[PDB]
Structure formats: structure tokens, C-alpha cells
């Protein structure tokens, strides 16, 4: 059984920051999507252009699994047709997205008493991200005459901020692990099918 | 510290147009989304619109959409508000403000504001006040004043005894009456033993109408 | 079904402005970059740039930066290529193209191309090409348009005559060469005259070719 | 988007907590965490105080925080200080890069002993009557806190028509003053035995009366 | 601004395998990348034949394959047939690069239907009559070559000349070999200012050259 490696995406010890989101290419394997219930506990699940109950009947050219952490009240921006600070500057689904967005609360893994400042997000950007564009620049934006020289300050804007997840937060501000499963259908031989 | 300076506020008749400008010091202007916000006298802030740092997009509150146009000239470090089809309810202080973060930002707020420029939309005609004495009554002190009635536009200034009387003076803010004309009062508390000995004259200066009125306030019997 | 339909062929004079278009259909037009590709006659593909129609983010090739304007009107699912002042060197086929998917960056989808031709009626100048079997001919220079008929000795010399197809120079004018291979023993006896006729200008020229 | 609903006023003593609510709809503050607050001192431009419901921009005292529950956001001021006396405006994202402000809340920092208003009611001057106009002028001074309600009586019947009243204005001595006008025709003035200006301040009413014949 | 270099031309007989190299590819391991191959027939838009280095769209014959070694991609066409006679372009994509896309210089594939034949080259100097009109054109006539693909280079005193060259596409002659012509337009001073001029025609890996002298 040449099963797709969903485990290393969904069961990864640490997830990426949303601005530096991870992408796993999934090709030439059997995708048993029923195993996702064991890798992620009690997860939210929205599909677009596919029905969630027929995933094991479908064949795709490739699958992509993008993963990152955002706070709970941002999960709604990981959807086609959405705008917001995450959709605009961090991770952008296209309006014609075909795939599923899976999110689950990761407070137990990703919050810390003092705050998890390792998860970060981008604050502003020269333009909105295009679909599946990734911007990991940390360069300080120089607005004034004086060069910044890697020192944020007056007229010198560091473009990221940390979430600082703490377990005292309400769920809307708790960390959620997100996996975006993209289902790519080209006019080409399929390489990812359900068990059937 | 970027400084924002609005200009162009004036008295304008309903139906006419007015262009406001907002000039930014230094060079940071081109890096920031810029906003217009207004505030009617005694009322709340009203968000009017935003133009992207690079002019790529402009967004408008429904209350000004199709009437006002926001633009910017990054070569002049200047933001503009072109106000068309003005109505009485557009009377306000107009502020320009810059986004807290540069580039495309929007989601945070407005951290640097100008001091504002005042727009008065009115069909009232320039008119100097009628000034009437508020004569003191016939514990050791008495209130007297002057009623400064029916002038347009703001402001009026009031002194007492050509500026020699300042202690105990309070000049009130104006009311805007349904006529479209302003009125206010100025009162001074004086020792009642001074009445009939000390002369009390309020000096009302209304520069827009080029009128000055000096009204003596005499005791009554 | 993804389709890119480009505007029709253009014939322009040097110095004119031109705007050509590429209309997308069958997909979410504002969700994909569209690319433009130039192909000059007999030359290779050159990537010109891309535009994202959703927000008109444009990325030009370093070789086309400032040389052409790519724009978009998303309200009608169209992107454009525009020149303020055309040059003869802009003569080319122009393609628009779109990557296969959000995940497959290769240009699977292509418009059908727009041919842009940048180009006065002129008669040819004929010049003889003297030999050092010998080789002699005549050079037909700078004429428009095709065709041009070449004869030798009023058509009595045909064996060994090779009239080459004309070259379409960048200026829009044609130049053509015709040569005949003759025995070297007749270089002093036989006089070879080349007869050039160009109908669109009524110019019949006869040029003698002596060693 | 309709103006977001805030209480008109809130008060506290130095060191106390003060809270201000901001209620919108499922399309603005209930939809987004982009909720911001501004502070405005008299005669000054607003100052940015809170964004993202509970984040503080650079330089804003840690005493300012926020929370949000559904369609209502809250500004929470711990350790209230005299300088916090100001108007506070919430603002919420409303979609499509548009924001909307709340109507504003006047915050009073109780900063001095209560002082009852001095009320002086001036009848119309003979000069104004000779010009066939009549204005009763009720001047109210030296009260604290700076909030009064003014009711006019003709004989003893409430009058609403023709009254204009100013918002309390700070005097030089840091107590407050206010003014109210009753505009009347000479006939209306002469048709009543008396007129009264009734000033209610901190639950207690002070009244002055004038009579055409007195 | 990197160039992807392909051979100007490659040829094979029907049924053979041929390979086309594409050198100079770079990638950004931190970004998105692809290597593509396109086929283009006369008058038609390019057709994607190989994508993501090695993959074929549905309907593309498995005679086409792609590979990559270091900075060089290769297209192999097995069982070569007349239908494959076309121009082929490699292409590289790197999301972070300026430019993000590059097409290679292109390769003309000829499917040989007769023995190879080397070009005959005849180079005429400018006529005395043409010089009197203050113009100068060198005429390089190229005939009887097969297959119909040549590259033409001009040299003046062994120094390469690029400006002022116009060259025709090969045309089939009556004997079913091909002909082409190339012109070098020069000023009269330029003609007299160099020791010699040479027309160099490269065909199937072999170069034929002719030289002319002022007097
Ligand atoms: C995830 O990985 C950890 C690593 O120790 C393992 O203990 C756990 O069982 C894994 N969970 C699943 C669902 O495979
Ligand atoms: Ni009555």
C-alpha cells in the first residue's frame, strides 16, 4: 500500500508560521483521506469543488498539502474569495480553489504559559499575495531617508509580528493548525487516487 | 515625526465644490495609505475613505461615495479630497491621517493625524452680530454680560473694557440656530459694589463681516 | 474550458501607437497571471512579462521593461499590450499565455497570436554582380511589394538561372538576387543582360553584367 | 454601515477601572477582529489607542486594553488617570477596506469636589425688545462635574420651542459653565406672568425666574 | 537575465532518437520552479510537450521525454517522424527570478528525407555601380543544401559583424535541396576600411566560407 504521506503533514511536531507556510507535494500514491481523523483531533473541514464524502472515489494529477498555524478567528480567511490580514499578506487561496481546508485547535501543542512567539505573521505588504504566493522576507521596510541597517525603529518597519499564543486565550485567539489540501486536476495521467 | 497639515477649509454654499489638501512633511508620504476622517461640530468622527500608498485603489464610505473623490500626488507629498455636491451636513472639521503601517496595511488604524481644516457648508450670508446688554440684577457679586446674536460665519471674539477686564470673564461657545446664524454670550462676574461706578463695555469683533460692536452694559432700576 | 482569444492582425506605420488585447474565458480571470510572448519573424520566443488581472500587478522582463505597457481590464476579462510609438523592430507575432494551473507553472494555454506588422511604394534599384563555369547575376534592391519577375537575355537564357526568393527587410522593402551559371568560355563572347520587371510601380530595368 | 453604538458618557475616579462598549452588527464588529479605539482631547486630533481589539500601538499606556464578544467590543481602562479625560471612539472594519466609527463616549475623570451651578437668568433687554425680538438668557456657571440639563418654564408649563443650549464649557477655574437661550417674540414674552430656567445638576435642581412686569 | 542555450538545429532520420540540450538553467530551492519544453509548427502557437522537467500532458506522445542534469535540460525524441519537424523551445521558470520565465534560444529539428548535402556558397562583392550611389551590399547566395537549416555569420578581417545582416528562410529548389540568401548592408567607407569580408555558412556542423577583395 503506497499511501500518501499525510502523517508527516498532519502529525508534524511543529507547524510553520503562516507567512512561511510549508508545502508538501503529494504525487504517485494512494490517498486514504479517512486516516485524517486519527492524525488531527476534532477538526474543522471545508471542501470546495469536491464533496467530502466522495474523496476516496476521486483521482487527481497531484495533491498539495500546505500547512501553517494561525489564530482561530483567522481560519475563515483560509477560504476562496476572502480578504483580510492573513488572506492579503500571508496565505491566499484563489477564488477557484479546488480542495479542502482542514483546521484544528492546537492550543495544547502551540500555546505556552509565557506566549509562543515563534509563530509569526506578516503585517503589511507592497501588494496582496497572489494564490499560493509565499513571502518569507524579513527585510525592514525603510520609509525615511535614513537606512535601517537591520534596526527597526523610526521610519523602519519590521514586517512581521508574533502571535504570542497563551493557553489563557479564548478559542478565537488560540492557535489552530491548518492544512490546505489542493486537488490539482490537469489533462494528464492521474497520480493520486483513493483506495477504491 | 511626519507632520500632516490640512488646508482648504472655507465657507461654501450647498451644491458647490471644494478641494481640501493634506501636505505631509519629510518623505515618508509615498509609503503610507492615507485617510480622510471628518467631525461635525460637537459630533463624532466619521470615516470617509482611504487611498493606497501607491494610489492603486481608493475606498469610500457610503456617505461620500459618488460625491467626494480622494486622490494623492506622491510627487508633492499631498493628499486631496475633492468634495462635490456639498450639503449642510458636510459641515465639519476634515482630518487627514496616515496608516499605522506602510505599504498595503489597512487593518490596524490611523496613528498620525493633521490638526484639521474647517469646512462650513451654508447658504447663510455673512452677517455681523446684534449685540444686546445683559444688565446686572437690581452675595457681594453680580453677573452681567452681552448677548451676541445672529452672526455668520464663525468666529466672533469678545473682550471686556478693551481687554482690561479679564478676571471672572467667561465667553460661551456659539449655538447654531435654525436660521443658520450663530449666537453666543459672554458673562463677567463683578463686585456688585462696582456697579454704577465702573463702566462695563463688551467689545465684539466679527472679522468676517468687518464689524465691531462695543456695547455698554448699564445697571437697571 | 480555458480560452485566450487575441485581437486580430495589425498593420501599422512606424511611430503609431497600438493596443492589442487578449480576452480570457472559461475560468476565473482574476485568479491567474497572464503572460505575453514576442516572436519576431523567423526568431525565437521571448517572454515579455506577466500581469495579474485581479490587481494589475505587472512583472516585465528586463528586456521589455519600459518598452511596452501591459495592462488589464478585469471587468471584461481582458489584458492588453500597448506601445506609444511603434518601431519596425516591433514587427512580430505576440502571444498571450497562461500557466496550466495554480500548481503547474508551465504555459499550457496559449492565445492564437496577434500578428503585428510595422511598415511607400518603391521601384527596385538593379545592380550587376560580375564574376571573378562562372557565376554572374544582378541585385534587385529596395522595392515594394512582391512580386518581381527576373529574366535573362529576354528569356533566352534559362538553364542555370537561379532567382532567389526575396528577403523582407525590417524597413518593409524587399531585396532579391538572381544569378546564372554560365561556361567561362563565353565570358568574352556572350553578353548577359538581366531583365527586371516590377508591376506595382511600372519599372522595367535591363542591366548588363560584364566581367 | 450604521454608526457603532457607544454609551454617551462614562465616569470614574483616578485609579478605578472604566469600560466603554461599542456595539455594531454581524457585518462590522461582529465579523472582524479589526476593531480600533481612538482618544480625543478637547480641540485636538484623535489619538490612536487600540487596534485588533486589544493591542496597543507604540507609546500607548498598558492601562488601555480591550475585549470583544460577538457584535460588541469593549475598551477597558485600568488605573484611570486625570489625562484619560477625553472622548473615546471605537471603529470597526466593515468589509471591502471600509471602516466605521462609533458615536463616541465622553469620559469624565472625577477631578474636583462637586460644585452646584450658579444660575443667572437675564430677561430680554429693552434694546432687544425695541428691535421687536426677545431672548431669555440663562447663564450657568461654576458647576462640577460638567453636566447639566436645562428645562424652561413659561409660567409653569414646559417650553421646548425656541430653546438652544450649549454643551458645558470649561471655565478658567476648571469648573464648568453652560448657557441656554429661550428665543421668544415680544408678544409671547408679555403673555406669561413669568419664565423660569431650571438647571438640574447631580440630581438637584436650581431655578431662576424673571417676569415681564417685574 | 540568463540565457538558455539550445543548438540552433538538430537532425535525424525517421525512426532515430535525437536529443536537444538546454544549458544554463538555474533554480531557487526556496521558491517555485519548472522546466518546460515547447513544440512549435509553422504558423501555430507553441505547444507544451514536457512540463515539470519530465512530465507529458495527455495526448503528447511518449516518444517525447525530458530530463535534467545540473544546469542542463534535455529533450529526447525517439522514433523520430515527419510530424516532429518543428522548432523546439526549452523554458525555465523560477518564481523569485527576474525574469521569472525564460525561453531557450530554440532548436530547429529536421527529419531527414534524403542524404545530407553541403551548401554551395557564392559571395559577390558590392558592384562599382552600387558604390557610386553611396551604398554597399554584400550578397551571399547559399544553394543546394539539405536539410533546410543553416546559420550565417559574417566576418570582416576575421572580426564578427552583426549589424546590417538580413537572411532569408531556406526555400526548396527545383532539385528539392534548399537555398537561402544573406545580405550585409554597409557604408562605402566600411567596405574599404577592412582588409577582407567573409560569408560563413554553417550547415550540419560543417562551415563553408567565401571571401571577397576590394580589388
Ligand atoms: C504522531 O507522532 C508521534 C511521535 O511520537 C506519535 O507518538 C503519535 O502516535 C503520532 N500520531 C499519529 C496519529 O500517528
Ligand atoms: Ni403659555
Numbering used by the authors:
A (entry chain R): 333 to 528
B (entry chain H): 1 to 138, 143 to 225
C (entry chain I): 1 to 119, 122 to 134, 142 to 220
D (entry chain L): 1 to 214
E (entry chain M): 1 to 215
Task: Copy text from the publication.
Here, we describe a highly potent SARS-CoV-2 RBM-targeting mAb, designated VIR-7229, which has unprecedented activity across the entire family of sarbecoviruses. VIR-7229 recognizes an epitope in the RBD antigenic site Ia,28 which overlaps with the ACE2-binding site (i.e. the RBM), burying an average of 950 Å2 at the interface between the epitope and the paratope. VIR-7229 tolerates extraordinary epitope variability, partly attributed to its high binding affinity, receptor molecular mimicry, and interactions with RBM backbone atoms.
The parent mAb of VIR-7229, designated S2V29, was isolated from an individual vaccinated with Wuhan-Hu-1 S, and subsequently infected with an Omicron variant, resulting in the recall of cross-reactive memory B cells. To further improve its cross-reactivity and neutralization potency, S2V29 was affinity-matured using both SARS-CoV-1 and SARS-CoV-2 BQ.1.1 RBDs as target antigens. Although the affinity maturation approach yielded candidate mAb sequences containing up to 11 mutations relative to the S2V29 mAb, one of the top neutralizers contained only two mutations (heavy chain V50Y and N57D) and was selected as the lead candidate (designated VIR-7229). Moreover, we determined crystal structures of the VIR-7229 Fab fragment bound to XBB.1.5 and to EG.5 (XBB.1.5 + F456L) RBDs at 2.4 and 1.95 Å resolution, respectively, as well as of the parent S2V29 Fab bound to BQ.1.1 RBD at 1.67 Å resolution. The affinity maturation of S2V29 to VIR-7229 selected for two amino acid changes in CDR H2 (V50Y and N57D) and resulted in marked improvement of neutralization potency against SARS-CoV-1, which harbors a leucine at the position equivalent to SARS-CoV-2 residue 456. Although CDR H2 residue 50 does not directly contact the RBD, the V50Y substitution leads to reorientation of the neighboring H3-Y106 side chain and formation of T-shaped pi stacking interactions between the two aromatic rings, possibly preconfiguring CDR H3 for binding. Remarkably, VIR-7229 neutralized SARS-CoV-1 two orders of magnitude more potently than S2V29. VIR-7229 featured a remarkably narrow escape profile as compared to its parent mAb S2V29 and even more so relative to Omi-42, SA55, and S2K146 or other published SARS-CoV-2 mAb DMS profiles.
